[PDB]
Design a protein around this ligand. Structure first.
Ligand SMILES: O=N[O-]
Ligand SMILES: O=N[O-]
Ligand SMILES: O=N[O-]
Ligand SMILES: O=N[O-]
Ligand SMILES: O=N[O-]
Ligand SMILES: O=N[O-]
Lengths: 244, 244, 244, 244, 244, 244
């Protein structure tokens, strides 16, 4: 019938904030699917899934996300362990489908442990805690993996949240440059453009509730009882502002 | 068979301004066919077309115009929703025939609702309202999509019309550079050349009467009862004049 | 027999100015073949050829030389008209053979009318008359298409002819930049190099006699009874000298 | 089988300057075989070869050395003429075998006429006489083709010869850059390296005796009765010295 | 099937420093498998393996790691020798499996001899001893191959160890740029990132005991009886600090 | 058995200077094989080999190393001579196998004569002796071919040897630029990098003994009875230092 009238009638319909925001979340960029990662770990791993996941996290943090490549530069024993992990958990490189595991995904799905492991693994990461201390004193080790974004409570007060993300970004700037010998022709802003979408996706995901995320941030020593960031976090956020 | 004479006699024929301008309008650039878009929505969607159209507008404004691509990085629920929408509405990408739907066409055909939805969607757009506010105070959220051009009454007094279009162009300028990173190095003038044709086409189209367009402008708070643009529009029109 | 003597005997033959110059003309660069264009229009079009040619000229001036592309961004009605024109006149894009019509060729073959149409179509061209007025006051609208080169009488006095071509070139510089987002790394001289060969070919063609061409230039208000260019032409030629 | 001894005895053998220089002349660069070119013209052309050769020289000087390419942008009459010439003379492009004709070879073999034709063809060459006049007053029109090198008497006194060749090189320098746009950024010295071999080859070739070459130079007004270069040559030789 | 809870319980599990560091060592980068290399040499070579290994080390240090490529530019005798070595030892290029020999692996596995051979091979290396002497006086010849890292005792006092490794890195810095010309434009820090992993891997490997490594350092004159680095090492460690 | 002990036992083996240096020589870069060149010349040429080799040397020096290409720009007679040489000696371009002749290889294998021929061929080389005199007075003609490196006695005193190679390098810098219109974006050091490996290979080859090489250098007037370079050589070496 009358198309102009239909458009006009359509414009007169409610602009429902609760409804729209639900769709935004449902349709938002998702870098990885944590619930599917953990389901697949439990599926492939049975009783061994927890111990194997810790190994895989150590592999992700100290060797990276390419299982077949790291095998080419590894001890005979280590290589056999990794081959057995690839075979058991059907591990892939890069960004495969939802139904496929990667080392990075295991690390991100279980970031509550990953971030703690970083306290131990500091001197073996692509960028060491020693280096980070040179940019910002007592740089929080818990922030030293892309996984950490899954620990950030997005409901923190505007300035606290910003401090946390800025402080984390200081690491992300260094890390991205080290793992990519191509971001040489890249400013701070240009490097950020490649890391903030996966960062923000994890910050805003529905995996681990806001309260549980903040509890982790508190237990890690990154915020106090009110969500105010620690001295170290404040220092690292300040360093990000003046970093290039 | 005297061709020079034929060329000459052809030159002696009336240059009828009325007849030629009618041909200009017939042949003019058209970005989309709003009437056909509504018809196709009504056709494919039946009783669900209205709710589906809103979802499709939210997708268009927050994720873009490529339904297959966005699905690769999305929650399981959202991926299922978009898949079904693709199958139900035979969604395509880019600029197919008038007999085919895209996400951008849905938002353009139903601009009256799209522009109200921008108020809610502000923080989630490729260029946020907060970013717009740094260029021009309280930038009108209703102007923050190419769709807005379909709400502009071309019968507005010259200076009021130009103010509306200049204010809108301030957004178009930022948005075009974000969506097409290869326009970052181009001048305002050059970027304008890439958005001006679809803008003017929607401004001057026969879809939705001038009187209804103006009443949307009045309802949105963009003009007053006497056709005069608000302070926010004037501010934004001035920012566009001195923008780079 | 003796090759050296044959070359020497050959060198002793007349260097016939009338004969050589005839060969130059016969062998010169020809961008399009106006007589073949008009023959094909009359062939394909019958009684409708004159009206259709005017439509095609309007299409060429306001949409360009790509019939299948412009159809993708056009009203349903306009698109059906163009499809019928393509089918009837076997229209092609770019530079096909002598035996093939294009919109550009129709415009150039009938430049006596095309140049007059420009007075009407000014504000709808890729570069508007408004813009040209910003570079040179009262810029002659008749000069605002590559077609105009077919109107230039090459027997005009050296300085008058130069003024006409310089004034036209001011437009050609702007036009070439607008239709080619590649001549960004191009100086005035570099842009000229791409437009002067088609310009000069048409200036020197044997289609429309020198006297008839000058009559057009006079009727257009571009020269007086002695071939002296108008004030507007003189201004535009001066602007070309200092343009970059 | 003592190879060092064989190498040694080989070194002890005469270095005969007369014998070696004879080998230099046998093996020297030859740009074209003038005798064969005339023979082929006479063969393919019969009674029409002289008139056809002149047309071919006009083509070579005003359109270039690619008969198939030039045909694509030419009048109907001219296209038919070139087609027939291609078929009658089996014209080729570039540098085929000595048993094949090109347009450039015809002009080179018949340089005595080619160079006189330059007087008439001046405004229509890739570098015009008027352009040459801006570099050196009254630049000799007879020097404005690579063909001219075949008219140079190498037995001229050193300083006269060098003046003729320097004056000619002024043209070669401009012409090489026009014909090969990728030489615009190169130094005079570098451009010289690209034209000097065919130049010297024609200067020193056995086609047309030194005495007849000199009498052409005298007839052309390039040298006087005592072998001395004209003012125009001297001027042009000096302009080449200080050219970039 | 509560995945958040599973993630949470996983986070509550011990972060056992001893257990995690054991996993780091298992999974650590390994450049080559020295034990397997010797086994393969002994296997393929029988009674000739020792003499063949020395030839292979000389090839590695003076020609590189690509046996097929070097053969193309070599004396007849040498080409025959390398061909036979390739056939006898099944030599490969690059980084194949642990069950395959390369020239570089032979030199690395047998580093104690390789490093002594550098004294003799000095003038014939890609970076000569004389060049090293210009950067740091009497640069230790024993350090002038990546192999040297396998002679470094990691149990040396921190400052002595670092001095040995810094002195060695001065060579690694020059050598990496010569071998990979695309590293000439990179910073010291960037070049270091390309040599540090295989360096540290050999430093910390379980092949050859710390005590035997140190006694090689003492025998080579690189440290004294009290573990202290020689003047030459200290000089070279200082040159690395201020190197670009 | 015990791999660590085997490596340690291997390190305890002699580092035999005489033995190692023999392997270096056997394994060194070889650009061409002079003994194989001369054997092939004698094989293919029989009684005509010596005269044909002189022709081939003249061809190499005045036309280059591409027999099929030079034929395309040559007299009928010269071309037939070269075709007969290609057929008889199975000549190739570039760097084919040991068992294949090239013009360059004939020139280098017989450099004792080649270098003498250069005194005659000076003004016909790609870079003339006249040009070289402009860079360094009385530049030694004998040095004006890559072949000359086969004449250099590497046992000359350090400073004399360096003078000889520097003086020769002055030519090599000019020559490499002239035969390669790509080394335009190349410094002196960058050009040297392309010519020193073939230079040094020939300087250090075992073809023609040190004493015989020095005898040639003496007979050429390039060194005196003690091996001290002439004035001309000293001048040319000095010019190389300050050349760019
Ligand atoms: O990318 N979703 O954490
Ligand atoms: O082309 N916009 O209706
Ligand atoms: O290009 N001939 O008008
Ligand atoms: O090679 N010119 O006769
Ligand atoms: O990985 N070096 O033993
Ligand atoms: O490259 N051996 O002379």
């Amino acid at each position: 019938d009358n198309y102009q009238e239909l458009r006009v009638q359509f414009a007169a319909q409610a602009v429902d904030r609760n409804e729209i925001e639900q769709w935004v979340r449902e349709f938002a960029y998702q870098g990885f699917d944590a619930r599917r990662v953990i389901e697949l770990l439990k599926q492939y791993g049975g009783a061994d899934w927890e111990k194997d996941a810790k190994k895989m996290i150590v592999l992700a943090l100290t060797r990276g996300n390419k299982p077949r490549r790291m095998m080419m530069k590894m001890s005979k024993e280590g290589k056999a362990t990794v081959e057995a992990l690839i075979n058991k958990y059907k591990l892939k490189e890069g960004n495969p489908s939802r139904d496929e595991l990667t080392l990075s995904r295991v690390a991100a799905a279980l970031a509550g442990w990953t971030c703690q492991a970083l306290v131990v693994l500091s001197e073996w990461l692509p960028v060491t805690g020693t280096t980070m201390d040179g940019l910002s004193p007592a740089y929080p080790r818990h922030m030293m993996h892309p996984s950490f974004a899954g620990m950030v409570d997005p409901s923190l007060p505007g300035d606290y949240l910003r401090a946390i993300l800025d402080a984390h970004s200081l690491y992300l700037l260094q890390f991205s440059r080290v793992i990519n010998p191509n971001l040489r022709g890249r400013t701070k802003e240009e490097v950020a453009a490649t890391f903030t979408q996966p960062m923000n996706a994890a910050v805003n995901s529905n995996f681990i509730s806001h309260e549980k995320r903040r509890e982790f941030l508190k237990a890690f020593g990154l915020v106090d009882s009110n969500g105010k960031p620690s001295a170290a976090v404040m220092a690292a956020a300040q360093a990000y502002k003046t970093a290039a």
